[PDB]
Amino acid sequence: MDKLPIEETLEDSPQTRSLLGVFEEDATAISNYMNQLYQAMHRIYDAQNELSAATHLTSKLLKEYEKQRFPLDEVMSSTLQQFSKVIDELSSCHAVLSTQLADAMMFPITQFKERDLKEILTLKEVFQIASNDHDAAINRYSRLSKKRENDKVKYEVTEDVYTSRKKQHQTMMHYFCALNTLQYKKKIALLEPLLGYMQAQISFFKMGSENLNEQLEEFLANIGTSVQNVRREMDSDIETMQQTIEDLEVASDPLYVPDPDPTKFPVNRNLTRKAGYLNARTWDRQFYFTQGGNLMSQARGDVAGGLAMDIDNCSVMAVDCEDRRYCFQITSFDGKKSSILQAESKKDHEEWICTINNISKQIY
Amino acid sequence: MDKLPIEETLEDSPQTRSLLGVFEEDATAISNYMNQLYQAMHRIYDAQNELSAATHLTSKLLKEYEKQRFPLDEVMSSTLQQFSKVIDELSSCHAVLSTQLADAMMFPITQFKERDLKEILTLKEVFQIASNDHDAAINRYSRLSKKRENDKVKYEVTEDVYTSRKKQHQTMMHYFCALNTLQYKKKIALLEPLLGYMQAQISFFKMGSENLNEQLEEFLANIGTSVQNVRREMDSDIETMQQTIEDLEVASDPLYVPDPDPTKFPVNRNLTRKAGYLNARTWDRQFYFTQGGNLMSQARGDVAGGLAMDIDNCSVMAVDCEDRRYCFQITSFDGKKSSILQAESKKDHEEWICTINNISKQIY
Structure with missing residues (x-):
């Protein structure tokens, strides 16, 4: 120390x-x-x-x-x-x-x-x-x-x-x-x-x-x-x-x-239901689908499906509109008109018209 | 899952x-x-x-x-x-x-x-x-x-x-x-x-x-x-x-x-050794001490002690210098002079002179 x-x-x-x-x-x-x-x-x-x-x-x-x-x-x-x-x-x-x-x-x-x-x-x-x-x-x-x-x-x-x-x-x-x-x-x-x-x-x-x-x-x-x-x-x-x-x-x-080979993908004219995107008129694209005798619709930003048309005893026909291809219009058993709807091909066009007619005449 | x-x-x-x-x-x-x-x-x-x-x-x-x-x-x-x-x-x-x-x-x-x-x-x-x-x-x-x-x-x-x-x-x-x-x-x-x-x-x-x-x-x-x-x-x-x-x-x-009560601290005139700080001449303060018949010296920033004076058969006396108090000078048995050294009081002054004289005359 x-x-x-x-x-x-x-x-x-x-x-x-x-x-x-x-x-x-x-x-x-x-x-x-x-x-x-x-x-x-x-x-x-x-x-x-x-x-x-x-x-x-x-x-x-x-x-x-x-x-x-x-x-x-x-x-x-x-x-x-x-x-x-x-x-x-x-x-x-x-x-x-x-x-x-x-x-x-x-x-x-x-x-x-x-x-x-x-x-x-x-x-x-x-x-x-x-x-x-x-x-x-x-x-x-x-x-x-x-x-x-x-x-x-x-x-x-x-x-x-x-x-x-x-x-x-x-x-x-x-x-x-x-x-x-x-x-x-x-x-x-x-x-x-x-x-x-x-x-x-x-x-x-x-x-x-x-x-x-x-x-x-x-x-x-x-x-x-x-x-x-x-x-x-x-x-x-x-x-x-x-x-x-x-x-x-x-x-x-x-x-x-839009238009598949018509020899390989025939038009289905005997459907009892259809679902798919359509343009509606100034034109918005939305999803349409048939349910219980109703044509219903839903946009991409939407929670549930709203109503477009009742299709019991309705009429539907091809329509000419704004120089567009494949347009059709429903008229229900009230006499009232839907928006002018547009399909994407002859076959899609025919398929919608036929399905709606099918549904309209089976409620009997 | x-x-x-x-x-x-x-x-x-x-x-x-x-x-x-x-x-x-x-x-x-x-x-x-x-x-x-x-x-x-x-x-x-x-x-x-x-x-x-x-x-x-x-x-x-x-x-x-x-x-x-x-x-x-x-x-x-x-x-x-x-x-x-x-x-x-x-x-x-x-x-x-x-x-x-x-x-x-x-x-x-x-x-x-x-x-x-x-x-x-x-x-x-x-x-x-x-x-x-x-x-x-x-x-x-x-x-x-x-x-x-x-x-x-x-x-x-x-x-x-x-x-x-x-x-x-x-x-x-x-x-x-x-x-x-x-x-x-x-x-x-x-x-x-x-x-x-x-x-x-x-x-x-x-x-x-x-x-x-x-x-x-x-x-x-x-x-x-x-x-x-x-x-x-x-x-x-x-x-x-x-x-x-x-x-x-x-x-x-x-x-x-520097100067203690002289009735309580008498001057020691019978010393055979002394050590203490002194001024030397243009004046530096250093530490002096007596050893084996030699007066040696050492500054604060120094490793070992150098030599100042041989004090066998030397003479020493009070000196007057630059109007300073308590100065003395050694002269050895060669006839050669030391620096003029300065003590801090009458008693310190007398003590150094007496000690050096004591040492100088005891080698016999």
């Missing part, structure tokens, strides 16, 4: 100031090193805090899953409740760890930096300034006139040496005491936070390990199998859908054109 | 577009929610990484403690080597955890966001644009002139309906397939990262717990007692120093003035 001699302070030898210099070099080296350690440990504390926050947020989000108003379980919902429980338990372990790290690791290393190293620098400056004042006082004293006596000036210059030497002595001794005390504090401040950190880790691993049992392992293995099941169902569904799409592309290719 | 009917795509009913709208609302809600979960889990991964880094840095700093060139152990040094070992083991646990979190939690949730949700938005746009093109094509077709036949224009306008309806159909079906596939992926992407995270935690707690044994507890209890010992030694040393300082303040108060 290195120690500065307080007994040597009054004499204030260069050799004494030399010994001081070595305690000051050490104090600077110690400060440099303990600062790097403070910064590393501060990063551990901050990260553990962030971990506690993010883990708790994860759990909370898993709990809110139900409370979200979803358009499209008993198994999923409960599965997520089980995950949210274990994650929230783990979240508590981090929260307990973070607070113990703040108390048992950060507090003592902060105190070393903010109290003890601060005191060294303060005492060092008070001393430097006392030393400077004394140097000045003894210089002025040394220059007193031997030949012309002036009692008052001589007193004042002598008294300034008294006060400055007294101040220098007291400040040097207190600075020596702090530097000597620092030999002990350097050791406490190194070991105490490490011990705090390690005891906290022992508590953390014990606490987390008690929440992580064979029962959890069972639950996890079960979820692993569920995930494999979903993947298998998905992959099978993909296969079914890819085949459905390839079939539909083949079947639909000849039907994309 | 909710599913859109691919069979309904060609007809493209408002009621079909209505069902699509509900799958799209769900996909948006799902994206929103999974994004929040991605962000929370990303914060866990980042924090665990930072923890791994800061813990490893802590250990490394503890190892470098010796390799720092310190002005002022076997116990401390080895104590720090034991801490650095356990902390580096813990550092490895975090490093193992971080990499498994990246692989088993982050990768699958990233893929959901970057592959699967991206595909939904891409397919949705391709479809919207196909739908818009078809709307335009059927509008132009609907406007063909019934009266003036022009085969080429009629062909081109009809063919644009073919191509746009074909494109709309294919794009709608592929978009339906992805949305249907998404019902399965939503479940995988929720459960797979949770399972990855939990299995990683089980490995971590097991791994960390195997490094934290009864033997470590023994080591920690021993360090706790050492710290208590250092505190006790420190507190006792503080008490000793405070008393030394109070004694020195009492003893030194009458000695701070």
Whole structure:
């Protein structure tokens, strides 16, 4: 245990100031090193805090899953409740760890930096300034006139040496005491936070390990199998859908054109129902479909289907309108007219007129 | 398992577009929610990484403690080597955890966001644009002139309906397939990262717990007692120093003035050695001290003491110089002169002259 001699302070030898210099070099080296350690440990504390926050947020989000108003379980919902429980338990372990790290690791290393190293620098400056004042006082004293006596000036210059030497002595001794005390504090401040950190880790691993049992392992293995099941169902569904799409592309290719090959797609004149898009008149396109003796209609941005025409005992005929092709008009058993409706081809045109006639004459 | 009917795509009913709208609302809600979960889990991964880094840095700093060139152990040094070992083991646990979190939690949730949700938005746009093109094509077709036949224009306008309806159909079906596939992926992407995270935690707690044994507890209890010992030694040393300082303040108060009470502090004329600061001449203050028949000297910024005068068989006398008080000059047994030296009081002046004379005449 290195120690500065307080007994040597009054004499204030260069050799004494030399010994001081070595305690000051050490104090600077110690400060440099303990600062790097403070910064590393501060990063551990901050990260553990962030971990506690993010883990708790994860759990909370898993709990809110139900409370979200979803358009499209008993198994999923409960599965997520089980995950949210274990994650929230783990979240508590981090929260307990973070607070113990703040108390048992950060507090003592902060105190070393903010109290003890601060005191060294303060005492060092008070001393430097006392030393400077004394140097000045003894210089002025040394220059007193031997030949012309002036009692008052001589007193004042002598008294300034008294006060400055007294101040220098007291400040040097207190600075020596702090530097000597620092030999002990350097050791406490190194070991105490490490011990705090390690005891906290022992508590953390014990606490987390008690929440992580064979029962959890069972639950996890079960979820692993569920995930494999979903993947298998998905992959099978993909296969079914890819085949459905390839079939539909083949079947639909000849039907994309408004006017299909009339030898392959004859006009159906015996339908009892039809549905499809038509233009109506100043012209909007909407979806028409027959239902229970009614022609109903629905636009793309609409919730349900409105009414267009009653088609019990109605008449329907081809119409000429605004130089357009494939127009027709219904007149119900009221004598009242529908909008002028437009089909997309001769066959579509004929199909609508025939279907409406079919429906109109079967209510009997 | 909710599913859109691919069979309904060609007809493209408002009621079909209505069902699509509900799958799209769900996909948006799902994206929103999974994004929040991605962000929370990303914060866990980042924090665990930072923890791994800061813990490893802590250990490394503890190892470098010796390799720092310190002005002022076997116990401390080895104590720090034991801490650095356990902390580096813990550092490895975090490093193992971080990499498994990246692989088993982050990768699958990233893929959901970057592959699967991206595909939904891409397919949705391709479809919207196909739908818009078809709307335009059927509008132009609907406007063909019934009266003036022009085969080429009629062909081109009809063919644009073919191509746009074909494109709309294919794009709608592929978009339906992805949305249907998404019902399965939503479940995988929720459960797979949770399972990855939990299995990683089980490995971590097991791994960390195997490094934290009864033997470590023994080591920690021993360090706790050492710290208590250092505190006790420190507190006792503080008490000793405070008393030394109070004694020195009492003893030194009458000695701070250059000229002490001459009835209480007689001039010592029988010294065989003296040491103290003197001015020398254009005047510098330095520390003089007698050693082995030599007067030696040392400035504040100096490593060792240089030579001023040999004081075997020398003469010394009071001198008048530059109107200064308390000046004297040595002349050795060579006949050569020292600098003009200045003392700080009559008593200091007399004490130096007497001591030098004492030393000069005892070599005999």
